[PDB]
Ligand binder design. Structure first.
Ligand SMILES: Nc1nc2c(ncn2[C@@H]2O[C@H](COP(=O)(O)OP(=O)(O)OP(=O)(O)O)[C@@H](O)[C@H]2O)c(=O)[nH]1
Ligand SMILES: Nc1nc2c(ncn2[C@@H]2O[C@H](COP(=O)(O)OP(=O)(O)OP(=O)(O)O)[C@@H](O)[C@H]2O)c(=O)[nH]1
Ligand SMILES: Nc1nc2c(ncn2[C@@H]2O[C@H](COP(=O)(O)OP(=O)(O)O)[C@@H](O)[C@H]2O)c(=O)[nH]1
Ligand SMILES: [Mg+2]
Ligand SMILES: [Mg+2]
Lengths: 430, 442, 52, 48, 442
């Protein structure tokens, strides 16, 4: 049960590079591609992410796409860059210009056939195909436009599989680009139709994680991409190791989404704690559960205290009793009952996996479906309405070719998504 | 003589591992399917035959199939310690799970895998000369256990007909829970299970956790403990076929004695001398103490209180050094008690069995060694309370069509929910009606 | 270009550790994971005898 | 039968003891591996 | 007591290599034609005579001819390891192939080579004293196998007359295919085979691929595996001539028992214990299991489902340690089954054979070693479905004369296509009429 990865734009390619470092470390694959692991348990599911190259070697199932090769040359120069198949690097000759319409319509249609050709050659080689995994930012230019184009083409070609996206949403406090609201709104319009499940991460919540929990004096983008890579590599762990209570991406989707538009989720990973404190307190399921539900540990600006949980999922890695998991999830639901949706009789799903991440005795990754998500969209919608009423920068997009009705449709669809979350927050029996 | 075991999904395969560990150790079959000691003439034994068949070279192989839609659990069996015991055809695995959807298992995916299972069962049933039932282990909370268990029981019931089918079933505990969609799957399972099973024994994990904390001294239990307890119960019930005894009980006698009307076939199970090794040498364990023990609610493996209902029939299994007179004195003392009540149409409420083989002790196990044990399965109207809480959770969720779009997309329409809910409502009314005292004798 | 015979032999030596080469060889039954003994007369039960 | 039960209890206790010893040895093994991994990671970060 | 083998074209010669490998290894003849000193001591035996003749110096040489129009396969035999076994005159090779053209083999090129073949067969048949039939191996999909096989069978049938001719023929599989013109060649071949063959055994490569995937665990088979299976089948049918047994079956008895009407001579073949070493040590293999196996469609070497027709006759050959009473009990159990049906005009549906020599094991082989085996050849109306599919493919191509100019250029009238297609249509109607469920009394 194998996943195919696509990495798009600068943010996506850098996070992907850190992800493939983390995954290659967990399965003991040298940067030359040679298997060097130390237990048969590592080898017996290597197929899930790797294809086999000649004499020993393994190659990672990823497609790299970008509009200017600067990033591609940076990742190829990195320490694990050699592992990647040369034919899998796709790049153009001129930039996206931070413009969604350019990225979607002009260079997009020029390159898009070659990316689908690479994805199909890789997909048709699988003996049974599980969902796709895509990393991109929504605020950029080639990331947003070409990512949503590609998402639409893969959803046309593989409608029976799972479609998964990880996406870094624009922050409310420090923008790097002026036209972020347009690109975000159009991308959310594309995602809510095409995607099956989309995870959203701010840059402000990760900074607050770094400053408060890890007490880092001078964080860098390598740390931010490591935080993202930990959860990304964690969600798939039950696909590829034994355990007492198996789980699957499709099983996650079936248990988390009550209605098909409500598929946007928050992420967290629990045993984050500074090196000085770690000697004074051992890991245990009560401690993990306490960190897991602390809003300090959630990677989205919206805070859970302003919403209610529809559903949540926890995947535990390590050797532990199931009784402790069940009783912890019961006690948290009973003691904090106002923050849990009252019609669903039990909001938490649990899963248990035998193999922890290297150097930790235990770990849990947390996925949450919370109605606080409305706040993030509301901020952008507001910024969009301020910009759109005055035609602030629209001539660039119209000169590329966009009709204004697309902008009004995307605004209406995002506003309806916000309304649907708000309606389910305030529902009652009667 | 022979019985065939069918293991479905994750709970059923994991409980199967404990069962076959126990049955091997009780008969003396090595993990590679061999036999120690002598094999020459002078002595000659047959008790294994109920569960194993021997090859011409003298290897033993067991009468079981392991069925799963995901590979991981059967591949764990294939790479584990018992690799050489099972025939590789018996370990059947699909490509992808039923994703907690009964509809996906029943309609989409199980339809491809079901014919291999039927071919394996046919090949087993042809190598028998006194088959006397099927034993099935599954959980109704998950997708493949519900959907494929129902589909397979329907096909088995058409092909084999009158042969008995006994299910051991794990219901979703009343407040411990593992997945959100458990009520829908349990209702839909119970609709199929009502028509196509002869006796169903009910288990809840919350009860076995309580029993292992209070009686055993285990602070932090895990599934291996529960599975070893289940294995002990199944071994106790099947011991009557395999060893010498004073009062034997054939599997058809269970159905004749326990089931008064053809729908009233759901039974509670409990086991008495669950005790630790340090306590066991401080106390005698006579017949009357364990007979008094099996009726206390602290002994039960299902979360129900029998004081809220009436008993219809009880089946009491004694194994080990017991004398029938002590069993009679115990049953008469139980009968005297005022908090134990039987329906007035069942005057002779008890069936007894007495077998000479004491319960086996497993090297890594947590139970003590004891000279005698008793196991009870009993039919009582209190079980109606267990269904009512699942139905209440179903009604709460179903009021908004909360998850129904998954089920409708994979093929199950919408009417089937209402049909199943009405059938379980009728089962509740059956348990209400059977328990109503007769108004007059004329 | 081929680096002669020693390199080719070591190349084929590094290949069989692949799972595909183990469970899917060319024109052969995949190898057993434990030892088996073939009896003198072969597999199967011998026919039971009776008095003349 | 009194002595027979006594000697059977003795052999069962011995088997339980050896199983527990094997389990404890494996636990210690994995614990020391994890500790070594943590130590080397901390040293690397400090050097950086 | 003797049989002569004729191998034609590529498939027939390659299957011949596996056959003669097997017959040598079974008798004990070395690759250089000698026989070791310990096989020829203490007793004096003749069983080789069916397939080998000895010279006055004691060298063995085999009773076969190899016919091809291209040199390469016969040159492989001439330069290989068995170079010294065959007499060099027996290995006959032409200059150029029949290029998938039936017309080139039959009219233009085979006409030059056929008289040498007839002279070799005559020189062989004159040095015999109990010739009891011809065995012919060819494929009907290719040009030289069809055209030269037909021409040679016609000449043999005029010269030798009443003597029996049994063919093993590889027909085009229903969806794997290797060449475009297969339907034309197979129709034109079948026209000649109707008049000039006593029993025809039908084979499809797709069935042997399925059997090698399903029973053996081989993902990537090649022609040597299929040819070794075919060789085992031929050894099973000819074992009745060569070794001691309880119920022998002479080659004339097959023809007497299997053919009800002179056109209805096409038979299906299957073989039971195709099994790997790991499965073989997990299972007993009694008579009743292999008898039940031979009737399942997963065991057949031709891609047809016998459930769509009715059996007219079955011939079951048992070899190895079997006793007649178990064969009788097995056949009575098969007869009891409801999915096995015989035409009502054939009440006594079975012929049995029992031989004491167990099947031989080949050093590089993939079959396990087993104490007993059974092989079946049977006549059934289901075969009519294979011809209907060949006729549909012929009709599709012939409606537009898709390739006919090659055949007309090499010497053939266009009319011969329509004649052959009408004759095969009449064969389809024969199988419809013979299979009639019942006739009315009025
Ligand atoms: N006693 C016991 N119960 C288990 C075990 N594993 C899971 N369960 C329980 O069974 C229910 C979950 O059912 P599953 O067996 O996981 O469902 P499934 O058969 O795997 O169906 P799929 O999820 O589609 O593969 C929950 O109530 C669990 O508590 C086990 O090993 N032992
Ligand atoms: N089982 C088996 N089938 C074979 C073998 N060789 C060829 N075939 C099949 O037979 C058909 C081809 O017939 P050929 O024997 O090649 O035809 P030919 O007799 O050589 O006729 P020409 O091509 O004119 O020389 C195809 O369906 C092949 O798959 C073989 O060695 N074993
Ligand atoms: N977390 C993270 N964010 C990044 C990284 N690089 C850029 N960003 C953010 O992504 C946005 C810029 O988008 P960009 O990737 O340049 O879009 P593109 O031009 O289409 O590739 C800004 O909000 C940046 O802060 C990175 O390595 N990690
Ligand atoms: Mg499962
Ligand atoms: Mg040829």
């Amino acid at each position: 049960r194998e996943i195919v990865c696509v990495q798009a734009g600068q943010c996506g390619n850098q996070i992907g590079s850190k992800f493939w470092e983390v995954i290659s470390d967990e399965h003991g694959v040298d940067p030359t591609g040679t298997y060097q692991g130390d237990s048969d348990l590592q080898l017996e599911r290597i197929n899930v992410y790797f294809d086999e190259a000649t004499g020993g070697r393994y190659v990672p199932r990823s497609v790299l796409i970008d509009l200017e090769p600067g990033t591609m040359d940076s990742v190829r120069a990195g320490p694990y860059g050699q592992i990647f198949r040369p034919d899998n690097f796709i790049f153009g000759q001129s930039g996206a210009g931070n413009n969604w319409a350019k990225g979607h319509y002009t260079e997009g249609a020029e390159l898009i056939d070659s990316v689908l050709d690479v994805c199909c050659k890789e997909a048709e080689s699988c003996d049974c195909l599980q969902g796709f995994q895509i990393c991109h930012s929504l605020g950029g230019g080639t990331g947003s436009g070409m990512g949503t184009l590609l998402i639409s083409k893969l959803r046309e070609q593989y409608p029976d599989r799972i479609m998964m996206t990880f996406s870094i949403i624009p922050s409310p406090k420090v923008s790097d680009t002026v036209v972020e609201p347009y690109n975000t709104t159009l991308s959310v319009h594309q995602l809510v139709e095409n995607s099956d499940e989309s995870m959203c991460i701010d840059n402000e919540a990760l900074y607050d994680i770094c400053f408060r929990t890890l007490k880092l004096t001078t964080p860098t983008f390598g740390d931010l991409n490591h935080l993202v890579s930990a959860v990304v590599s964690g969600v798939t762990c039950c696909l590829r190791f034994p355990g007492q209570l198996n789980s699957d991406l499709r099983k996650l989707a079936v248990n988390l989404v009550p209605f098909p538009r409500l598929h946007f989720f928050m992420m967290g990973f629990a045993p984050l704690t500074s090196r000085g404190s770690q000697q004074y307190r051992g890991l245990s399921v009560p401690e993990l559960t306490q960190q897991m539900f602390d809003a300090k540990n959630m990677m989205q600006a919206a805070d859970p205290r302003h919403g209610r949980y529809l559903t949540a999922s926890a995947l535990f890695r390590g050797r532990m009793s199931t009784k402790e998991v069940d009783e912890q999830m019961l006690n948290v639901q009973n003691k904090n009952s106002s923050y849990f949706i009252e019609w669903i009789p039990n909001n938490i799903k649990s899963s248990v996996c035998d193999i922890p991440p290297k150097g930790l005795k235990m770990a849990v990754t947390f996925i949450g479906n919370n109605t606080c998500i409305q706040e993030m969209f509301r901020r952008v919608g507001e910024q969009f309405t301020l910009m759109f009423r005055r035609k602030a920068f629209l001539h660039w997009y119209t000169g590329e070719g966009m009709d204004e009705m697309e902008f009004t449709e995307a605004e209406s669809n995002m506003n309806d998504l916000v309304s649907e979350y708000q309606q389910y927050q305030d529902a009652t029996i009667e | 003589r022979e019985a065939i075991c069918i293991h479905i999904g994750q709970a059923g395969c994991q409980v199967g591992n404990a069962c076959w560990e126990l049955f091997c150790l009780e008969h003396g079959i090595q993990p590679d399917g061999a036999m120690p000691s002598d094999k020459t003439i002078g002595v000659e034994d047959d008790a294994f035959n109920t569960f194993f068949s021997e090859t011409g070279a003298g290897k033993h192989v067991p009468r079981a199939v392991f069925l799963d839609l995901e590979p991981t659990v059967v591949d764990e069996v294939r790479t584990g310690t018992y690799r050489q015991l099972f025939h590789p055809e018996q370990l059947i695995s699909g490509k992808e799970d039923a994703a907690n959807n009964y509809a996906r298992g029943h309609y989409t995916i199980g339809k491809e895998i079901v014919d291999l299972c039927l071919d394996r069962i046919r090949k087993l049933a042809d190598n028998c000369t006194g088959l006397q039932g099927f034993l099935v282990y599954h959980a109704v909370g998950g997708g493949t256990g519900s959907g494929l268990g129902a589909l397979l029981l329907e096909r088995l019931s058409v092909d084999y007909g009158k042969k008995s089918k006994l299910g051991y079933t794990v219901y979703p505990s009343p407040q411990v829970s593992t997945a959100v969609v458990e009520p829908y799957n349990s209702v839909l399972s119970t609709h199929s299970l009502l028509e196509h099973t002869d006796v169903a024994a009910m288990l809840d994990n919350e009860a076995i956790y309580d029993l292992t904390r209070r009686n055993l001294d285990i602070e932090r239990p895990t599934y291996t403990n529960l599975n070893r307890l289940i294995g002990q119960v199944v071994s106790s019930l099947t011991a009557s076929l395999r060893f010498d005894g004073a009062l034997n009980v054939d599997l058809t006698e269970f159905q004749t004695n326990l089931v008064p009307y053809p729908r009233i076939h759901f039974v509670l199970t409990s086991y008495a001398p669950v005790i630790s090794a340090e306590k066991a040498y401080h106390e005698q364990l006579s017949v009357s103490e364990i007979s008094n023990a099996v009726f206390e609610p602290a002994s039960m493996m299902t979360k129900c209180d029998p004081r809220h209902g009436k008993y219809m029939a009880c089946c009491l299994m004694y194994r080990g050094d017991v004398v029938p007179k002590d069993v009679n004195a115990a049953v008469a003392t139980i009968k005297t008690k005022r908090t134990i009540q039987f329906v007035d149409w069942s005057p002779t409420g008890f069936k007894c069995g007495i077998n000479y083989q004491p319960p086996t002790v497993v090297p890594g196990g947590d139970l003590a060694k004891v000279q005698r044990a008793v196991c009870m399965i009993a039919n009582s109207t209190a079980i109606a309370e267990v269904f009512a809480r699942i139905d209440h959770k179903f009604d709460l969720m179903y009021s908004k069509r909360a998850f129904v779009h998954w089920y409708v997309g994979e093929g199950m329409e919408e009417g089937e929910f209402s049909e199943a809910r009405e059938d379980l409502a009728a089962l509740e009314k059956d348990y209400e009606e059977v328990g109503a005292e007769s108004a007059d004798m004329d | 270009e081929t680096g002669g015979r020693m390199m080719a032999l070591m190349e084929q030596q590094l290949e069989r550790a692949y799972l595909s080469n183990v469970r899917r060889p060319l024109g052969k039954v995949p190898a057993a994971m434990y030892d088996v003994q073939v009896p003198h007369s072969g597999f199967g039960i011998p026919s039971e005898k009776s008095e003349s | 039968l009194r002595e027979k039960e006594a000697v059977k209890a003795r052999i069962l206790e011995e088997q339980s003891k050896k199983i527990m010893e094997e389990r404890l040895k494996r636990e210690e093994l994995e614990s020391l591996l994890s500790d070594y991994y943590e130590a080397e990671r901390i040293s690397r970060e400090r050097q950086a």
